[PDB]
């Protein structure tokens, strides 16, 4: 087919960053009795222009379901709340750390049990 893939693999499927080339015309001209230099001269530019760089997740190509903009959209959504809720949440975030810093291990275990029960 001519497909060439260079990059990361997880398990048995593409997962991570990868680079894809389609050298089909070069092989097509090579198989028809054309010397490699002439075939390369004929089909170098088209192959170089169609080089693709992609990020793959579990064998699927990302970038078509707005995966890139998720973080910024979520930040804007968090900023779209009412001021009182934002202030209370930000105060609670520091309060939780300040409370956990001084607790006993038994108290920590009980707190985690309570959190698990609530979840």
């Amino acid at each position: 087919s001519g497909e060439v893939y260079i990059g990361e693999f997880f398990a048995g499927q593409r997962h991570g960053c990868g680079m894809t080339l389609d050298m089909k015309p070069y092989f097509y001209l090579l198989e028809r009795g054309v010397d490699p230099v002439e075939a390369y001269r004929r089909t170098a530019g088209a192959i170089m222009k169609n080089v693709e760089v992609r990020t793959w997740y579990r064998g699927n190509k990302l970038g078509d379901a707005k995966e890139d903009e998720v973080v910024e959209i979520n930040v804007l959504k968090d900023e779209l709340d009412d001021p009182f809720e934002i202030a209370l949440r930000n105060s609670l975030h520091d309060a939780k750390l300040r409370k956990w810093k001084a607790m006993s291990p038994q108290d920590k275990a009980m707190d985690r049990i309570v959190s698990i029960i609530e979840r």
């Binding site: 089909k24 015309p25 001209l29 004929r42 088209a46």
Partner: peptide
Amino acid sequence: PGREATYQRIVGAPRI
């Protein structure tokens, strides 16, 4: 049939 057409489609230039 379909021999020159596939060359045009794949290579991108007419065959000499």
